[PDB]
């Protein structure tokens, strides 16, 4: 009943949302808006602008010279206009002229940022503030048009690029309050967030002291509980930052009902499966995207990422040939192929695509660690070290980069010199068995037996399954043997052997050495009967393992 | 079951050379009339 | 003159970033075909046998045995290899069954 | 009476008054619920393949294979149409899919062999046509392709014997006779080529290939 009424509300609004945003030549939200309407559940044109025929002539000149890449020429003709709708177009033309120019200026420059972590940009900011004061609304009024709301979006984005955080956020809230359903505005707002605690602060602000201009937005939509962007905000920020979830479940199923055919949600839904190390289910989820939407180079980087871990080179060779045929200029299309080329042990070529995949979009820092790995297999440790090191300098909170850099030193003899890197990676993901076991090996190899004991015990607790603790137990028992106390290591020798019985006779290699050692000590204890069965149980190991127990079996049988 | 390209033939060398020779005949005799 | 007014072909404004033309060589890259070219990496006639073995893995044991040394001549006369020989003309159902027989069947001279 | 007449008439051979078959299947499509059944789309595929409407080959074949991925009635025509279109990737997927499911049936090995055929591997695809021929007799596709492997690259002497075997063991088709006559023509031996061509014309009166030859 009411859901259908909501359905009836969304198409008209999304018709409006895609109309003006495409009409104002910004494609960050216009492309997403039509996508959202296309996937909406099955249940005269709309247009309006307060422009005079004299000034409307300049719009056609302004609009057509915009997408013709002649941004500078558009500014010159549209200099003297005073309407807020057109005033945005001039400064948007002005802003994108700088953004395009900056891209041309640096192409050899891979790393982006300032080591410690304007005047031309500050020129743009003044017209916004000067025009905003002159205009006779200045927000906070019921009669607030889309253009003024859209003007605040440019002000926010121009403030962010100057690193003036905590003022662009307020500007973005003012823009969204007057006009929601602007994805490019939301993305710039999500970007300025840095930590999960910041998300909780903004989320509260969105609930108590935030409200939309009910005049501009259609009815039954200005309510926060029945909004859509707030919902899409919940699914977005809460999971890319991997923050603590709240008000997230009931929203997710609500969006799947309203948007059953929305391609973006399923890829996000598949990505959720990806983030939880659930690879098998995510593959089924992704297979619907490719079949339903074959041309989508937006989230396929994870698809080819799934396939690489999954193994199955024939399928990867199929994907690599198919994806490259669409176009070779997306950031993703240059990372899928490199994965296909990496599986074929052709390293001097695979190393090439990772550098290529990063150049198109420098934000894809995940390709840095992969490019570093591709040096290690080339027996070139020097080149690998820099590739990993750039990754942490882009963002220090990269567990992948620290781990990949730690190994490159661990492969060489510099065991202790790699201990700091492994220690740093510990803080990123403490709840992992893999990292803890490696730390124990470094301590073992550096003559720190007192610390290595405590390191392995922590790894044991983190392991989800007991069977993975078989390898640690035997090595942990050895360290006690180096700490001249043979009685203490017996208890751990009981556990590692007992896991074999609890696993209906796993008969694994690292338990074979456990039984041989355990039987040998039992002979010194004088208990031949308790040692006889140990040799018989390990009679299905290696060639040297069976003979070692067989002769021990004869020795204990004689004294039995 | 698949069909290959059906047999087709183009201008041979013998006939084209014969036409070349003929072209030389009517490009050789007419200038005698002019002269 | 008139250069940018015509729009009948791929132009400089149809691609999103005008500076992508600086590279402009990635279009002319032959991507490696799926299966057999993986054999040239190890090498840096063998590739065809590898592809032949890969496609040969999809047999049953008895079917593989029959085709283990199988050779087919042009006139249709068929030669069967026993791991005796069963040289008989093809398209008759009986010869194949006979080949299966002395393959998996039991034959004993018994003195 | 009328529905069974149309149903039988769907399956008749082409090259003769195909307009009548088109009208009959159009009548069968709308009037009765049999609008998009297996045999009607199979007849459309056969018609497009005879008239070399390869685009319609792929649309109708994909729209039917999306329901039944392993319909053996249409797979030969589907493989020929794709081979004409040289869709190497799609052929590899089909060959692999049929390899995991129907190793015994000759359709799978014919598909793998034509996958090799599309990559210009005539000498190797020779063996795979041989395997497809052995696994199923009375199959024109396998033996005719095998003869094509003989005739395409060198070794012309025994392609004649291969085509003679095709003609004798598969009577009633003009195609083997036409191929044998054209191969004799390739030898520059004339009277025998004309004799086989008139034989093929006798078997099939309406075929552009035989008349062009």
Curated annotation (Swiss-Prot), chain A:
Compartment(s) of residence: Nucleus; Chromosome, Centromere, Kinetochore
What happens upon changing residue 39 to D?
In CDC23-54; G2/M cell cycle arrest at 37 degrees Celsius
Work out whether the entry's keyword set contains Nucleus.
Answer: yes
Give the GO biological process terms: anaphase-promoting complex-dependent catabolic process; cell division; positive regulation of mitotic metaphase/anaphase transition; protein ubiquitination; regulation of meiotic cell cycle; regulation of mitotic cell cycle
Q: Name the source's superkingdom.
A: Eukaryota
Q: Name one Pfam family in it.
A: TPR_8
Q: What is the effect of changing residue 55 to K?
A: In CDC23-51; G2/M cell cycle arrest at 37 degrees Celsius
Impact noted for substituting residue 419 to F: In CDC23-56; G2/M cell cycle arrest at 37 degrees Celsius
**Modifications after synthesis and translation:** Phosphorylated by CDC28, which is required for the early mitotic activity of the APC/C in its CDC20-bound form.
- What does the record say mutating residue 50 to S does? In CDC23-44; G2/M cell cycle arrest at 37 degrees Celsius
User: Outcome of residue 260 to L?
Assistant: In CDC23-49; G2/M cell cycle arrest at 37 degrees Celsius
Q: Please state the pathway this protein functions in, per its UniProt record.
A: Protein modification; protein ubiquitination
Describe the effect of residue 332 to K. Answer: In CDC23-37; G2/M cell cycle arrest at 30 degrees Celsius
The UniProt keyword set, sorted, is: Cell cycle, Cell division, Centromere, Chromosome, Kinetochore, Mitosis, Nucleus, Phosphoprotein, Repeat, TPR repeat, Ubl conjugation pathway
> Which one of the record's GO molecular function terms can you name?
cyclin binding
Q: Which parts are the TPR repeats?
A: 149-182, 229-262, 263-296, 297-330, 331-364, 365-398, 399-432, 433-466, 470-503
What outcome is documented for mutating residue 73 to Q in this protein? In CDC23-40; G2/M cell cycle arrest at 37 degrees Celsius
CC per GO annotation: anaphase-promoting complex; kinetochore
Result of altering residue 147 to D: In CDC23-47; G2/M cell cycle arrest at 37 degrees Celsius
PROSITE patterns from the UniProt entry: TPR, TPR_REGION
Miscellaneous section: Present with 80 molecules/cell in log phase SD medium.
UniProtKB/Swiss-Prot annotation, chain B:
Cell compartment(s), UniProt:
Nucleus
**Disulfide bond positions:** none
Q: Give coiled-coil spans as residue ranges.
A: none
Modification sites for Phosphoserine: 12
Q: Which domain of life is it from?
A: Eukaryota
What family name appears in the similarity comment?
A: Belongs to the CDC26 family.
What is the recorded function of this protein according to its Swiss-Prot or TrEMBL entry?
Component of the anaphase promoting complex/cyclosome (APC/C), a cell cycle-regulated E3 ubiquitin-protein ligase complex that controls progression through mitosis and the G1 phase of the cell cycle. The APC/C is thought to confer substrate specificity and, in the presence of ubiquitin-conjugating E2 enzymes, it catalyzes the formation of protein-ubiquitin conjugates that are subsequently degraded by the 26S proteasome.
Q: How does it assemble?
A: The APC/C is composed of at least 13 subunits that stay tightly associated throughout the cell cycle: APC1, APC2, APC4, APC5, APC9, APC11, CDC16, CDC23, CDC26, CDC27, DOC1, MND2 and SWM1. CDC26 is required to tether the essential subunits APC9, CDC27 and CDC16 to the complex.
Q: What is this protein called?
A: Anaphase-promoting complex subunit CDC26
This protein's species is Saccharomyces cerevisiae (strain ATCC 204508 / S288c) (Baker's yeast)
In the UniProt record, what gene is named as encoding this protein?
CDC26
Please give the range of the full-length protein represented by this chain.
1 to 35 of 124
From Swiss-Prot, chain C:
Question: Which GO terms are recorded in the biological process aspect for this UniProt protein?
Answer: anaphase-promoting complex assembly; anaphase-promoting complex-dependent catabolic process; ascospore wall assembly; cell division; protein ubiquitination; regulation of meiotic cell cycle; regulation of mitotic cell cycle; regulation of mitotic metaphase/anaphase transition
Naturally occurring in which organism (per UniProt): Saccharomyces cerevisiae (strain ATCC 204508 / S288c)
Q: What is this protein called?
A: Anaphase-promoting complex subunit SWM1
Q: Tell me the keywords, alphabetical order.
A: Cell cycle, Cell division, Meiosis, Mitosis, Ubl conjugation pathway
Q: How does it assemble?
A: The APC/C is composed of at least 13 subunits that stay tightly associated throughout the cell cycle: APC1, APC2, APC4, APC5, APC9, APC11, CDC16, CDC23, CDC26, CDC27, DOC1, MND2 and SWM1. SWM1 interacts directly with CDC23 and APC5, and is required to tether APC9, CDC16, CDC26 and CDC27 to the complex.
Membership in a protein family: Belongs to the APC13 family.
Q: What is the role of this chain?
A: Component of the anaphase promoting complex/cyclosome (APC/C), a cell cycle-regulated E3 ubiquitin-protein ligase complex that controls progression through mitosis and the G1 phase of the cell cycle. The APC/C is thought to confer substrate specificity and, in the presence of ubiquitin-conjugating E2 enzymes, it catalyzes the formation of protein-ubiquitin conjugates that are subsequently degraded by the 26S proteasome.
The highest taxon in the source lineage is Eukaryota
Pathway field: Protein modification; protein ubiquitination
Can you supply one Gene Ontology CC term for this chain's record? Answer: nucleus
UniProtKB/Swiss-Prot annotation, chain D:
Q: Note the segments forming the TPR repeats.
A: 1-29, 39-67, 74-101, 106-135, 140-168, 175-203
* Compartment(s): Nucleus
| Assembly description | The APC/C is composed of at least 13 subunits that stay tightly associated throughout the cell cycle: APC1, APC2, APC4, APC5, APC9, APC11, CDC16, CDC23, CDC26, CDC27, DOC1, MND2 and SWM1. Interacts with AMA1.
Q: Spell out the post-translational modification annotation for this entry.
A: Phosphorylated by CDC28, which is required for the early mitotic activity of the APC/C in its CDC20-bound form.
The protein, known as: Anaphase-promoting complex subunit CDC16
Which function does this protein serve? Component of the anaphase promoting complex/cyclosome (APC/C), a cell cycle-regulated E3 ubiquitin-protein ligase complex that controls progression through mitosis and the G1 phase of the cell cycle. The APC/C is thought to confer substrate specificity and, in the presence of ubiquitin-conjugating E2 enzymes, it catalyzes the formation of protein-ubiquitin conjugates that are subsequently degraded by the 26S proteasome.
- What is the similarity comment for this entry? Belongs to the APC6/CDC16 family.
- The scientific name of the source species is Saccharomyces cerevisiae (strain ATCC 204508 / S288c)
Outcome of substituting residue 57 to Y: In CDC16-264; G2/M cell cycle arrest at 36 degrees Celsius
- Domain of life, per UniProt, equals Eukaryota
Fill in the misc note. Present with 2753 molecules/cell in log phase SD medium.
